[PDB]
Amino acid sequence: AATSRDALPNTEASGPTHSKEIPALTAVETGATNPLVPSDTVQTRHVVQHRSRSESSIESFFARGACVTIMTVDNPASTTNKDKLFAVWKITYKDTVQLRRKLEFFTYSRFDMELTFVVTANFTETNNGHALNQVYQIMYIPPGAPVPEKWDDYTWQTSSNPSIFYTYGTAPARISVPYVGISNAYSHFYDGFSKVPLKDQSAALGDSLYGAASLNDFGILAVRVVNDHNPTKVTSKIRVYLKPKHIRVWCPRPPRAVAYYGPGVDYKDGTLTPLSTKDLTTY
């Protein structure tokens, strides 16, 4: 029944003491933190406490859209030697660092995912030609479904994959997704492998990456400009924002202290000294 926006406990007035009760003395070897409050070691006045922990609830701590990737696409002249660029991104929160670090204060999590898409475009060649307003197709390709090989091949039909057709210059696109994990929670850390190496099998055959579970965890987003080729080339970027709604988290962890180095917990030489010089008896 205690809610996140409830006020914290009042300070009760306490006077002088002389007893066998020893709140100040403890033993951290036990694994416990001493539950003390100011009235245990100093004289206090009565204060009616109004402050609350509302903004540090798990939901409120995460209640923000974070950028997780930038996808690049274009629409060139038909005469180009290089193919029309469509983008393919393997969904993850580990390409950027900020949301990753926040989620990694915890070992496991459950949440509904809100994805918001901000789309910007520009001219590249110092031309004077124009381009009519672009429509973009953001196709979700779940693990197993055919990945596009060309900006215009059959897969963009999307009979079953979810697609967003976004019109340039309109409000940024947005969809929600349920908790889609194949486990009862998302694992931010997996201390294991996806294969057991057997003795009767070759080393190559039993091998797999440390800490990786499903190779294609959540599938792909594929993005294209739906408009046909245009004389003047336009390049666009799709910025993807992830917000974890309706979230639950388990098993707290110390936050990432040295720079991220890949999708695992690995660290690079030369980045291992976060702390700065400060003298023991200097304020």
Binding site: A27, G31, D191, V196, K199, P254
Partner: protein, 268 residues
Amino acid sequence: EACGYSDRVLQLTLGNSTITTQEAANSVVAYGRWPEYLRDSEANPVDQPTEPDVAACRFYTLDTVSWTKESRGWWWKLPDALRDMGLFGQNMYYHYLGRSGYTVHVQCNASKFHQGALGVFAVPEMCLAGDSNTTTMHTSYQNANPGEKGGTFTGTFTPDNNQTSPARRFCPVDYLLGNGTLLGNAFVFPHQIINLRTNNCATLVLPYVNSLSIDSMVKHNNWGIAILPLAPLNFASESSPEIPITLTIAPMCCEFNGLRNITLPRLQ
């Protein structure tokens, strides 16, 4: 208690095994959850589970290691450290799936004239960092899984530069808890400290923790045990003191699903 009972004096009995201690600092139950069997409401594989009970839920003692002034720390993974322990290991390798909780009892006595403090941490999903700066996530199954001998921490990161035949092992730097986070914060994990003047053991009761009700014990370790000297060993005025550290661990409420022929892993 007025009839002599103490926080410091405990007896633990599991199966045909008993541990006594006269210098404990209470004992810890991780996240306040005692180990339990998998409930029908949370169950997933439908076949009748194997539950070996006293045959596997008993205290197994691993190889004793040695604490010296140069020790940087030790680590073990569960269930890996127990993979060769009597009928627990057998039940593990014969089944696809398995889940288990543990009582971890770390032992280290000295004398009223020695000093030092070991932080004993139980970490869920204790993913450790690799030795390479050319490839991430490349620690081999064999090196990730030392069995009962465990591994150790180092004070220095030193990258494997042999690109022809890479070592493919962890390089766990102690002040970074071997995983890129600061050791001073490891206390948010279930822990006890063996501070020689106060206590000669640590006892951690660990529930099965995972994002699943049951999983591959052979592919995945649920818990990591990390022991690090928070305050170094010291004795009288000797330059080279040594005291032993012994781990005894008991599986608890372990059950297994998916029986077939025995798994024979490539461990070297």
